Design a protein around this nucleic acid. Structure first.
Lengths: 130, 118, 118
DNA sequence: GAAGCCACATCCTCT
DNA sequence: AGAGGATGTGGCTTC
C-alpha cells in the first residue's frame, strides 16, 4: 500500500498537510554543526547534485528532498533571482502524492516553500494499486 | 519485536522509548519495516524536530533496507526536544520517487533522560 | 593570592567552583607553586605533584576519594569545550586556551612576574 | 516540586 | 600517561 485510498481527500482535509499548504517558513537543515561558510558551499553544491535537506521551521517537520521527476533543470533553478534558488521535488508523503516547492537564500540558507497535491502522480499511483 | 503503524500506509517501525537520554544508545534497535515491496539495498534515513528544535542532531541515522527491513545500528538522538515536548520523526525510504513516512510525538530527548525522583 | 583568579573566572559562591577555576586559584597562590605552577610559556601549567592537586580538589569539592585519575578525566572534558588543552608529550602539562587575559586582566608575562615564576 | 540543564565523579577499555 | 565512552549524582533554575 504505497498510498492511501482517499489520496486526494487526505491532502485537502488532514491538518498535517493543510498546515504545509500555505507559505511556510523553511530552512536548510544540513550540517548544523559546521561553519556558515561550509554550510553555504555544501548546500549549493548539493542542489547542483539534485538534493538537499529542508525542514519547515514553524512545525519543525524535516524532509529529505530529491530534485528530479518521478543533473536537473526545471526542478532546481538558479536564474529566477540572483542569489535565491528555486527548488522542486516530488514524493509520496504519508501515502499522498505531493510535490515540494520553495526557494532558499544561497547565503541565509533559508526561505519559504509548501506542499501542493499532485493530480498526475496520484492518478498513476492509484492505478498500480487499482 | 513489536512494530507499530506510522503516518504512511506503506511503513511500520519498532517501538521507541517515550523519554530517553540524549546521545545514549536506545534500549531496542530501531527498525523500519515496509509493507509493500521495496528493493533490497534501498537507503532509509531518519530525521527529527519540532517547534522548539527544527532539526535535531542524530547519529547513525542511515540504514539500508534488506528483506523489507531497515535495521538501524545504534541510532542516537543528540539534540533535545524541550521540556515536556517530543520529536516528530520523518522516515525517508529513497525509492523513485522517494517515499517518506512521519511519526509524531515519537520520543522525548533530554540531557538527563528518565531519572528516579530525588 | 596576587589576584582574585576565582572571582575573575566567574566563581561567585553561587554554582560551586569549577575545576578549571579551582586550578586557576592555585596557580595564583604563591604557596602552591610547589605542586602546581606555570611553565613560563603562556597560560601553560604543569601539575608537578598531581596527587596533591587531586587531594585539594577533593577536599574543596567534598569528595574524599578524589584522585588524579578522576581529575584528569575532568580536564579532558575541557578539550572539546576549549577551556583547557593538553600539551602533547609533556607529563602532566596542560594549558588554558580560553581568554584568561580578558578574564584576569593581566597578560601571561605580567602574571608570571607578579607570581615570581621561575 | 517536577523536570530541565550542568559539570563533574566513577569506572572502564584501549593504545 | 593519556584519550574518550557510558552512566550516575548532587547544585541549581525554570516551568
Amino acid at each position: 500500500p504505497r498510498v492511501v485510498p482517499d489520496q486526494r481527500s487526505k491532502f485537502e482535509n488532514e491538518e498535517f498537510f493543510r498546515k504545509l499548504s500555505r507559505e511556510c517558513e523553511i530552512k536548510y537543515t544540513g550540517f548544523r554543526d559546521r561553519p556558515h561558510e561550509e554550510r553555504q558551499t555544501r548546500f549549493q553544491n548539493a542542489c547542483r547534485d539534485g538534493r538537499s535537506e529542508i525542514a519547515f521551521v514553524a512545525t519543525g517537520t524535516n524532509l529529505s528532498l530529491q530534485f528530479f521527476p518521478a543533473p536537473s533543470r526545471e526542478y532546481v533553478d538558479l536564474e529566477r533571482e540572483a542569489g535565491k534558488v528555486y527548488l522542486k521535488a516530488p514524493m509520496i508523503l504519508n501515502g499522498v502524492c505531493v510535490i515540494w516547492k520553495g526557494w532558499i537564500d544561497l547565503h541565509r540558507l533559508d526561505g519559504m516553500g509548501c506542499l501542493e497535491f499532485d493530480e498526475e502522480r496520484a492518478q498513476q499511483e492509484d492505478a498500480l494499486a487499482q | 519485536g513489536e512494530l507499530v503503524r506510522t503516518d504512511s500506509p506503506n511503513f511500520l517501525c519498532s517501538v521507541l522509548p517515550t523519554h530517553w537520554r540524549c546521545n545514549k544508545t536506545l534500549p531496542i534497535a530501531f527498525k523500519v519495516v515496509a509493507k509493500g515491496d521495496v528493493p533490497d539495498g534501498t537507503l532509509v534515513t531518519v530525521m527529527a524536530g519540532n517547534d522548539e528544535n527544527y532539526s535535531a542532531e542524530l547519529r547513525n541515522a542511515t540504514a539500508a533496507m534488506k528483506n523489507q527491513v531497515a535495521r538501524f545500528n545504534d541510532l542516537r538522538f543528540v539534540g533535545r526536544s524541550g521540556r515536556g515536548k517530543s520529536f516528530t520523526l520523518t522516515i525517508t525510504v529513497f525509492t523513485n520517487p522517494p517515499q517518506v513516512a512521519t511519526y509524531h510525538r515519537a520520543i522525548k530527548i533530554t540531557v538527563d533522560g528518565p531519572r528516579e525522583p530525588r | 593570592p596576587v589576584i582574585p583568579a576565582a572571582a575573575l573566572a566567574g566563581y561567585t559562591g553561587s554554582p560551586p567552583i569549577q575545576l578549571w577555576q579551582f586550578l586557576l586559584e592555585l596557580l595564583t597562590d604563591k604557596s602552591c607553586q610547589s605542586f602546581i605552577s606555570w611553565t613560563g610559556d603562556g597560560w601553560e601549567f604543569k601539575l608537578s605533584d598531581p596527587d596533591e592537586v587531586a587531594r585539594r580538589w577533593g577536599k574543596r569539592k567534598n569528595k574524599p576519594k578524589m584522585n588524579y585519575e578522576k581529575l584528569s578525566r575532568g580536564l579532558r572534558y575541557y578539550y572539546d569545550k576549549n577551556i583547557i588543552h593538553k600539551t602533547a608529550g609533556k607529563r602532566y602539562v596542560y594549558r588554558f586556551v580560553c581568554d584568561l587575559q580578558s578574564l584576569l586582566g593581566y597578560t601571561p608575562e605580567e602574571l608570571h612576574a607578579m607570581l615570581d615564576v621561575k
